[PDB]
Amino acid sequence: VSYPIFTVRWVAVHTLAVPTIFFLGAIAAMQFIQR
Amino acid sequence: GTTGERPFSDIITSVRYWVIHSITIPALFIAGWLFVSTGLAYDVFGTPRPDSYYAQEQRSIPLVTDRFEAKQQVETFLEQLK
Amino acid sequence: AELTPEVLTVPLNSEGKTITLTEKQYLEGKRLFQYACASCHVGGITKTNPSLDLRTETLALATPPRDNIEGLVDYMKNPTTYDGEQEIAEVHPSLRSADIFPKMRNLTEKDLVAIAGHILVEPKILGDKWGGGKVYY
Amino acid sequence: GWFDILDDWLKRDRFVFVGWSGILLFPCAYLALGGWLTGTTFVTSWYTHGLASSYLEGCNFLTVAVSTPANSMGHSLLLLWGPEAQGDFTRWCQLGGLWTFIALHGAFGLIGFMLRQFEIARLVGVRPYNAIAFSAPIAVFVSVFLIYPLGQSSWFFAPSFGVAAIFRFLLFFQGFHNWTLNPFHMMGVAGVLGGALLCAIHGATVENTLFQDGEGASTFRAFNPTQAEETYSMVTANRFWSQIFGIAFSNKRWLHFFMLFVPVTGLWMSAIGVVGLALNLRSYDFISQEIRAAEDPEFETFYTKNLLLNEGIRAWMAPQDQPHENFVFPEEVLPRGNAL
Amino acid sequence: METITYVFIFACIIALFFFAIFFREPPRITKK
Amino acid sequence: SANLWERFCNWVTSTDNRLYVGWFGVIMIPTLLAATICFVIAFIAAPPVDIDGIREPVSGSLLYGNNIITGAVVPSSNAIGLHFYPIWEAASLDEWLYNGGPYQLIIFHFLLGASCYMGRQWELSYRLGMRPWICVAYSAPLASAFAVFLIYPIGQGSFSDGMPLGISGTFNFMIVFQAEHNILMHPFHQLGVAGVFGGALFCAMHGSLVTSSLIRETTETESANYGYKFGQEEETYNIVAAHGYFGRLIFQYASFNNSRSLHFFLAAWPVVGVWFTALGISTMAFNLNGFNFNHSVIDAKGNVINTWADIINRANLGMEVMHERNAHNFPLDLA
Amino acid sequence: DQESSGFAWWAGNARLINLSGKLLGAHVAHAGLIVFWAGAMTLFELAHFIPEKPMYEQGLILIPHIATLGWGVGPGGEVVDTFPFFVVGVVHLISSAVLGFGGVYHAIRGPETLEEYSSFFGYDWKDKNKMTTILGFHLIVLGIGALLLVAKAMFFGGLYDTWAPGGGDVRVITNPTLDPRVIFGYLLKSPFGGEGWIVSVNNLEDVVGGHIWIGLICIAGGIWHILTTPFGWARRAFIWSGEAYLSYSLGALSMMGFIATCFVWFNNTVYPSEFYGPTGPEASQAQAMTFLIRDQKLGANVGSAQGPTGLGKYLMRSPTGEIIFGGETMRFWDFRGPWLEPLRGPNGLDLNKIKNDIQPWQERRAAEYMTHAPLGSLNSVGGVATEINSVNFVSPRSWLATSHFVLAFFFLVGHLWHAGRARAAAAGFEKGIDRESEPVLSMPSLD
Ligand code: CLA
Ligand code: CLA
Ligand code: CLA
Ligand code: CLA
Ligand code: CLA
Ligand code: CLA
Ligand SMILES: CC1=C(/C=C/C(C)=C/C=C/C(C)=C/C=C/C=C(C)/C=C/C=C(C)/C=C/C2=C(C)CCCC2(C)C)C(C)(C)CCC1
Ligand SMILES: CC1=C(\C=C/C(C)=C/C=C/C(C)=C/C=C/C=C(C)/C=C/C=C(C)/C=C/C2=C(C)CCCC2(C)C)C(C)(C)CCC1
Ligand SMILES: [Cl-]
Ligand SMILES: [Fe+2]
């Protein structure tokens, strides 16, 4: 078939996918903070 | 059993996808990392740094004690080098 | 709010003279304190005899005084009772009894100074917590 | 008319059905989940409970949480642009604005979601018993995260969003409300525990009373997605239980309605109990018991024992659990048994 | 007085139990 | 007579008995009757029990000042520990009721029978030509009773430490447990509540979905239940309409369409979850407790920065410090 | 060869129920994983092992198993030579490759079936003779093994005896209890408090002795099965199929798993407190010892001391009259141990020995074991759930006991599961009720 790209599903998927990775990256950095 | 959306399977397999996401995914990652590692996050959320819970001597807690003048009261807590 | 060298300045001997530990010695002491003390002295108390703690004041009224590097170090070599009128190296870890308390074998004069320093620095940081028990947890 | 066109678009059968409801559901539901995930990793509870509560401070998935606002705030809605935060974001965070954010948002998100069920049901033309059922979880959220603290001094005594931060909510209710001794809480557990039984028992009863509709051992493929005959011997099941338990179903329509009733009725009862705990109208004691315990020093029941456990919980926790009260309990006033 | 009340209800539930198991409505197949 | 014993075995095993007294039943039926009869008498008229072995009798029966909610059958003495205490081990019944004798007679007979009850849940399934495994679902609730009535006592060194047989007595078991093991902070318990919460959830899920997608065969003023006859050929609900709705609630592939895969999940979830909860009590019976994050996060100077994990510890100390008032003589609670 | 038209993917290994050859690869590849672990773990343990420090304080569970067999240790469990540890570790690690080879081979190259490629090895599940015979082979292999221990103890060096007269030490057993009345006596022992059944073994003579009996009795049965077939009842009682046999062995391991849990938790002899930690009761006993010892030095008369309840702060009586330690520790009055025995008299703890025969090595032993009870958290924080972080420790006895109860349990479920399937498989309905001939429908209504 001739499927589209940007769809509603796409939007949704990204609202959760994009922040997640941004957080997983943030957290991953925290593993090195100390005192 | 179907709707307009392009079957994930195809996309997660399309070399185009990875050519895009090999850039996009690590990008977001390195961004968030920097968000923490540059100390920016600490200021965006007023979260104390390991050396900012108490003043050197003080062992008391900066408990906010009144609603309306809270913000003002909070600011003063940062004053005592807390 | 940090472990400044101001906090790492603890009394060296009975005659007021002091010594200043370094963040390296501290951590090292803390590690050694866990390796051979925590077992019975976790958090400044004494599980096998709760009447005597590691509070600086308690160590001050000890006999001889054990509230300084010199004091604690001697103790870790030849331990005595609170009045000092009796040596207890046979039922207390020490250098002269490492055969009986293997954990004390490795321990060298460097290690003993760190452990001693740790005991005097902790209460400076934790305060009341260090001496008391579950009440302060 | 645009309306019917707006409608048309919304009610379109996509991968993730939107619908009118979605206009309420998705905005909130995402903000609620988002705010938690935000606070969980970045915002602190220092200025609010004198507690580290985020990954950024060193907390792990268990110890992390979005803690309630100060007790000073009272029942304030704590709007980002309200008298407290004054439009400022950072301050808002430090005053526990993220709690009322997650709470109120998530609250509407549950309204939207039930509406969705209602809306989707209608379209697909099925009965809304999925909506009726979902009333139970609402009641719980409403009574515990809203009605309860609304009866207390402030939001500070509402359960903080987090794993560990919820365990203390449990321990608190024991120590202070003697919640386990409450008739409504009991019914509660009777429903959830009993509901988790029906689940298990019915499932197992079906899988082991199945007809053979295939030649393989893995009988999963052997199922007709397009109705027709019953996939399991309802007649055999009946006889089984009728001989091992003495009682047994025999009307799948009732057996299934029962499965809705039990856990939904349970949660409803557990809610009422808390709605009473808001006003502190608890089921703390049995007067006849206390009176005999006073006059007679040798009378001891597992009940009296428990109350002493509560006394200890209150005395040893209250100090660091209620900072705004500046409690100072001298070692000598602290209730304690022998040796311990 | 209370003891009596507690035991009574209990005794009543057990009575029910009996009747429920041995005096139910026989479960009839197909032609019901 | 075709042969007495041959007949006997044919009766016992007979699938024409109102209640299937099986082979396992031959052990079950007597053991369960002893347990129940002893219980009922104990709970109503038994006298005070010195549970903690410190001569401080705890009365838990109705006739001795208790009501349904507080009353219980008190665990055997701590002086007895794990020793076997059958009636014939006492100078008199008076001594036996004082040392919590009834408790053992009850727990042992119950656990015994409740096991055979599982064995029976297989037997009848065999005699009826249906697949087994139902008894395997019942293995979870049983494995709990075992964990709570036998494993924990063996582990802790005394039956006096087993869960009492009563409402309030059970709450005691919990509150104290938490204090000594911090169970809420243990993976196995969390999986347990996941299974139980989930169970109730799914129980409501299934229950609703199905009842809501029933094919109409009833009047507007007639019970929707009558639309089903015991011994039907075809199904009584539109599992395709059910899946159609639920598939739209979340999203298609996150919804069941196979009744068999549905019902397996429906059974698998709680049983597996409860299995772990049972393994939790059985593991913490050897003092491998929940996570201890006390004084974990500390600041740059060394100060202790509390977390909710610490606030939990205070609540725990209160329980610790107050339970069994007069039973401790020494610093550490190692029993 | 085998795919979905056999079993489902997640039940894959059941497609090998009738492929003797490949089903051998599994067992030979698997047995490699066990050897691999044992070896690779030993080396991991040794790599971290610190000689001048208790084993129980280092998370060891294999090195202490070797130590028990008298290897690399001496007086009081003192570690002398770490070579035997390194050896046992590396040897295994190697043999894992050899076995692993065979495993991989038989499962992807060699014959997919055995029956034809050699009728001696090929087998038939229902072949009651081949089964009793293969079983007979293994019953001998295990029997020799049981004797392999008796040899090490009597000839090749000995075992670690904590009860050693001069105090814990490697001792050569040269007098195994062979008296059946005693040996088999254990099996007739109660499993409750006091009489502890098998776990009550308290000296190496019985251990070594008992093993002699097992070694023989086992090989004896090994031959008997080679030379026989199951009788009449033996056949009309059991189910003969590939699964049924599994099940029987599942419940068997389960039972042994529970017995093992109690052994490592209670037993002092075959599990030396010197290498593992102090037993549960041993630690609680040690507290009573410690403080009875302390306060007595402060001038207190332990014999007449009255505690809060009026029971006896330090010493009280058991239900049968013996003098035991007081406090909650009254539940562990069945504890026996090297350090504590010299204080026991003919009536239990002797007030005179306690009053002036307590030795220093005992005081610090009591102190040691008191501060090392088997109490800890998942994240390894030794102490009570309310303790503070610092002492990273969880008794090996706690680890072993819990791990093995979980395994033992699930295996009992495994048993039930495979036994329930076998009975339905046999009779033939493990795949559903015959739509046509529905058994229940031919039975009278009980209603
Ligand atoms: C579970 C153990 C086991 C069993 C039962 C078998 C069985 C079999 N293997 Mg084999 N194999 C095994 C392990 C095993 N293997 C391992 C670990 C390896 C890797 C080295 C191999 C490698 C292997 C190969 C490469 C081949 C076989 C083959 C065969 C088959 C032909 C028999 C044969 O080789 O005679 C061999 C002759 C013997 C009877 C002599 C063996 C005596 C040895 C040297 C002593 C063993 C000592 C023992 C460990 C201690 C027991 C003593 C104790 C009782 C006192 C047969 C089915 C062959 C096959 O595929 O043909 C169809 C074949 O080519 N196997
Ligand atoms: C549509 C879904 C939705 C809903 C129902 C809510 C609801 C809410 N949000 Mg919200 N929010 C949403 C989406 C949504 N949000 C989105 C997508 C975002 C991201 C941009 C946010 C971001 C956000 C933040 C950052 C905050 C809230 C907050 C709040 C709460 C208080 C706000 C309030 O006072 O509203 C006021 C209600 C109105 C403005 C509705 C007016 C409608 C009328 C008909 C229009 C009339 C206009 C006219 C000029 C008036 C004439 C009168 C004349 C006399 C002047 C409230 C529960 C606050 C909160 O959580 O505090 C704890 C808060 O700080 N939200
Ligand atoms: C003597 C040991 C033993 C043996 C030889 C078998 C053998 C067999 N079992 Mg089995 N079983 C055992 C013990 C054993 N079982 C126990 C103790 C249980 C109780 C849990 C079961 C429960 C069980 C069930 C419920 C079933 C079988 C089945 C089967 C057969 C197909 C195998 C298969 O499904 O593989 C496929 C294997 C899997 C898909 C892997 C499962 C992974 C496990 C569950 C996770 C383990 C957690 C792990 C330790 C954590 C690691 C961390 C990870 C992140 C890396 C096969 C004959 C199946 C059969 O069809 O019946 C005849 C079947 O349905 N078994
Ligand atoms: C104890 C672990 C174990 C073992 C020993 C086996 C063994 C076996 N399984 Mg298996 N299985 C397991 C776990 C295990 N399984 C689990 C957990 C699952 C669930 C996911 C399955 C699911 C499963 C299915 C669905 C099937 C099997 C099958 C088979 C058999 C054929 C092997 C095969 O198909 O080769 C395939 C060959 C390859 C693709 C190469 C694999 C790489 C090799 C084997 C590993 C090499 C090891 C090491 C790295 C090299 C050492 C070399 C060194 C010694 C020099 C074989 C006897 C099949 C069967 O029924 O037999 C016909 C089959 O259909 N298994
Ligand atoms: C079962 C026997 C066993 C036992 C008793 C031990 C015991 C021990 N091991 Mg160990 N180990 C084992 C097997 C065992 N191991 C195996 C098979 C491996 C290979 C992977 C290792 C690898 C290993 C390493 C690499 C290390 C240890 C260490 C240790 C020690 C520290 C314990 C620890 O910190 O636990 C903490 C572990 C946990 C809290 C994880 C619990 C995992 C459970 C079982 C998961 C259950 C989930 C369930 C299966 C999900 C299925 C459900 C699903 C199907 C629905 C301890 C003495 C450490 C040590 O020696 O340092 C002192 C160490 O570094 N072990
Ligand atoms: C572990 C390896 C092993 C295995 C798998 C078998 C397996 C088998 N043997 Mg066997 N056998 C073995 C070792 C083994 N044997 C050894 C070492 C010897 C030498 C002593 C014998 C001697 C032997 C003889 C003399 C006979 C068998 C027979 C049999 C078969 C039927 C047994 C049966 O029906 O039991 C079921 C038994 C019962 C109905 C009695 C149950 C009562 C038990 C024993 C007591 C209760 C158990 C209790 C729970 C455990 C508590 C411990 C207790 C000490 C207190 C069976 C295939 C019989 C056969 O068919 O010959 C070919 C047979 O006549 N075996
Ligand atoms: C707040 C706020 C807001 C919002 C924001 C948002 C919306 C956010 C989002 C966010 C997000 C959205 C985030 C996310 C995150 C995530 C994460 C971080 C994850 C992680 C994960 C993991 C880690 C996983 C794990 C696991 C599991 C769980 C299972 C098992 C397996 C595994 C391991 C994989 C706004 C601005 C509006 C306004 C203001 C307020
Ligand atoms: C069948 C199959 C399977 C399985 C497999 C297996 C189970 C295998 C095994 C394997 C094995 C079992 C292997 C082994 C190996 C080993 C080795 C390879 C060894 C090595 C060694 C060495 C090398 C030595 C030495 C040393 C020393 C001495 C010291 C130093 C270090 C070292 C280490 C060097 C699977 C599941 C996959 C899939 C399906 C099929
Ligand atoms: Cl209590
Ligand atoms: Fe169903």
From Swiss-Prot, chain C:
Its cofactor is heme c. Disruption phenotype: Cells do not grow photoautotrophically under low CO(2) concentrations. GO terms for cellular component: photosystem II; plasma membrane-derived thylakoid membrane. The chain holds residues 27 to 163 of 163 of the full protein. The lineage of its organism: Bacteria, Bacillati, Cyanobacteriota, Cyanophyceae, Acaryochloridales. PSII is composed of 1 copy each of membrane proteins PsbA, PsbB, PsbC, PsbD, PsbE, PsbF, PsbH, PsbI, PsbJ, PsbK, PsbL, PsbM, PsbT, PsbX, PsbY, PsbZ, Psb30/Ycf12, peripheral proteins PsbO, CyanoQ (PsbQ), PsbU, PsbV and a large number of cofactors. It forms dimeric complexes. GO terms for biological process: photosynthesis, light reaction; respiratory electron transport chain. This is Photosystem II extrinsic protein V. Heme c binds at H41, H92.
From Swiss-Prot, chain D:
The D1/D2 heterodimer binds P680, chlorophylls that are the primary electron donor of PSII, and subsequent electron acceptors. It shares a non-heme iron and each subunit binds pheophytin, quinone, additional chlorophylls, carotenoids and lipids. There is also a Cl(-1) ion associated with D1 and D2, which is required for oxygen evolution. PSII binds additional chlorophylls, carotenoids and specific lipids. A plastoquinone binds at H202, F249. PROSITE patterns: REACTION_CENTER. Chlorophyll a ChlzD2 binds at H105. It is an enzyme of class 1 (oxidoreductase). The keyword Ion transport does not apply. It is a multi-pass membrane protein. Chlorophyll a PD2 binds at H185. GO terms for biological process: photosynthetic electron transport in photosystem II. GO terms for cellular component: photosystem II; plasma membrane-derived thylakoid membrane. Residues 42-96, 149-181, 277-340 are lumenal. PSII is composed of 1 copy each of membrane proteins PsbA, PsbB, PsbC, PsbD, PsbE, PsbF, PsbH, PsbI, PsbJ, PsbK, PsbL, PsbM, PsbT, PsbX, PsbY, PsbZ, Psb30/Ycf12, peripheral proteins PsbO, CyanoQ (PsbQ), PsbU, PsbV and a large number of cofactors. It forms dimeric complexes. Part of a photosystem II (PSII) assembly intermediate complex PSII-I; crystallized from a strain deleted of psbJ, it forms monomeric PSII before addition of the oxygen evolving complex. PSII-I includes 3 assembly factors not found in mature PSII (Psb27, Psb28 and Psb34). This is Photosystem II D2 protein. The gene is psbD1.
Swiss-Prot record, chain E:
The modification N-formylmethionine is found at M1. GO terms for cellular component: photosystem II reaction center; plasma membrane-derived thylakoid membrane. PSII binds multiple chlorophylls, carotenoids and specific lipids. GO terms for biological process: photosynthesis. It is found in: Cellular thylakoid membrane. The chain crosses the membrane at residues 3-23. Pfam families: PsbT (PF01405). Disruption phenotype: No detectable dimeric PSII, loss of another protein that may be PsbM. Residues 1-2 are lumenal. It is a single-pass membrane protein. Keywords: Formylation, Membrane, Photosynthesis, Photosystem II, Thylakoid, Transmembrane, Transmembrane helix. Coiled coil: none annotated. Its main location: membrane. Residues 24-32 are cytoplasmic. Found at the monomer-monomer interface of the photosystem II (PS II) dimer, plays a role in assembly and dimerization of PSII. PSII is a light-driven water plastoquinone oxidoreductase, using light energy to abstract electrons from H(2)O, generating a proton gradient subsequently used for ATP formation. PSII is composed of 1 copy each of membrane proteins PsbA, PsbB, PsbC, PsbD, PsbE, PsbF, PsbH, PsbI, PsbJ, PsbK, PsbL, PsbM, PsbT, PsbX, PsbY, PsbZ, Psb30/Ycf12, PsbO, CyanoQ (PsbQ), PsbU, PsbV and a large number of cofactors. It forms dimeric complexes. Part of a photosystem II (PSII) assembly intermediate complex PSII-I; crystallized from a strain deleted of psbJ, it forms monomeric PSII before addition of the oxygen evolving complex. PSII-I includes 3 assembly factors not found in mature PSII (Psb27, Psb28 and Psb34).
Swiss-Prot record, chain F:
It is an enzyme of class 1 (oxidoreductase). It is a multi-pass membrane protein. It comes from Thermosynechococcus vestitus (strain NIES-2133 / IAM M-273 / BP-1). This is Photosystem II protein D1 1. The record marks Y152 as: Tyrosine radical intermediate. GO terms for cellular component: photosystem II; plasma membrane-derived thylakoid membrane. Photosystem II (PSII) is a light-driven water:plastoquinone oxidoreductase that uses light energy to abstract electrons from H(2)O, generating O(2) and a proton gradient subsequently used for ATP formation. It consists of a core antenna complex that captures photons, and an electron transfer chain that converts photonic excitation into a charge separation. The D1/D2 (PsbA/PsbD) reaction center heterodimer binds P680, the primary electron donor of PSII as well as several subsequent electron acceptors. Chlorophyll a PD1 binds at H189. Residues 1-22, 124-133, 209-263 are cytoplasmic. It catalyses: 2 a plastoquinone + 4 hnu + 2 H2O = 2 a plastoquinol + O2. GO terms for molecular function: chlorophyll binding; electron transporter, transferring electrons within the cyclic electron transport pathway of photosynthesis activity; iron ion binding; oxidoreductase activity, acting on diphenols and related substances as donors, oxygen as acceptor; oxygen evolving activity. Belongs to the reaction center PufL/M/PsbA/D family. A quinone binds at H206, S255, F256.
